[PDB]
Amino acid sequence: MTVAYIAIGSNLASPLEQVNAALKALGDIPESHILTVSSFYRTPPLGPQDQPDYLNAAVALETSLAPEELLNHTQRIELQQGRVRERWGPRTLDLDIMLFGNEVINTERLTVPHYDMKNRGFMLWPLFEIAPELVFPDGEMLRQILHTRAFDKLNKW
Numbered sequence: 001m002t003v004a005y006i007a008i009g010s011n012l013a014s015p016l017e018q019v020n021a022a023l024k025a026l027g028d029i030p031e032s033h034i035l036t037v038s039s040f041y042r043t044p045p046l047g048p049q050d051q052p053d054y055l056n057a058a059v060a061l062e063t064s065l066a067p068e069e070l071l072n073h074t075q076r077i078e079l080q081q082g083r084v085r086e087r088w089g090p091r092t093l094d095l096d097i098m099l100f101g102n103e104v105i106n107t108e109r110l111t112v113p114h115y116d117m118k119n120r121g122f123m124l125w126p127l128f129e130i131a132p133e134l135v136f137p138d139g140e141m142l143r144q145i146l147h148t149r150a151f152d153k154l155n156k157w
């Protein structure tokens, strides 16, 4: 078993309802158990700014699934909650795999640690709440990133 950390985001169709339904669905993923859920945060949008504020959260999930098997299930949850294919536009549910233990994976389908996560306060702050001692695959400590980079603290939802 490995602990995966998943970021949740929603800014359409009642984000609180979306994130709750997504948590229940994550709890139904085979060979997996939720370990920890962060607080829910109201965050201003990165990317296009002409869209509603996001609800963001992070979850620690212990799993025996292969990384791409976990991805299949997170994408299925996104599809069932109405995610459909502008760039970086509003969405009902986004589930990103931030980390899958200390694995590094570089494929088109799956890139872990998530592309750009070290520059996203809406991912790092909820992650720090649930895993303050977290160390990245390259040896960087989550605490040092937040200590050294200018990331505004988030407001709770």
Ligand SMILES: Nc1ncnc2c1ncn2[C@@H]1O[C@H](COP(=O)(O)CP(=O)(O)OP(=O)(O)O)[C@@H](O)[C@H]1O
Residues within 6 Å of the ligand: 088, 089, 094, 095, 096, 097, 098, 108, 109, 110, 111, 112, 113, 114, 115, 116
């Ligand atoms: N760590 C990861 N978590 C989730 N999806 C990933 C991923 N690495 C790669 N992907 C791929 O990313 C594809 C689509 O991602 P999207 O959710 O549409 C982009 P986004 O979240 O709006 O921007 P971002 O990827 O810059 O956060 C999926 O088909 C999936 O295969």
Ligand SMILES: COc1ccc(C(=O)CSc2nc3c(=O)[nH]c(N)nc3[nH]2)cc1
Residues within 6 Å of the ligand: 008, 009, 010, 043, 044, 045, 046, 047, 054, 056, 088, 089, 094, 120, 122
């Ligand atoms: C370089 O600048 C960036 C461009 C795009 C992004 C994205 O994450 C992809 S779309 C998106 N998702 C969310 C989100 O979940 N929460 C918040 N607050 N904003 C979001 N925007 C990040 C940084």
Ligand SMILES: [Cl-]
Residues within 6 Å of the ligand: 012, 082, 083, 084, 090, 091, 092, 093
């Ligand atoms: Cl959507």
Ligand SMILES: [Cl-]
Residues within 6 Å of the ligand: 113, 136, 137, 138, 139
């Ligand atoms: Cl890393």
Ligand SMILES: [Mg+2]
Residues within 6 Å of the ligand: 094, 096
């Ligand atoms: Mg995303």
Ligand SMILES: [Mg+2]
Residues within 6 Å of the ligand: 094, 095, 096
């Ligand atoms: Mg995504």
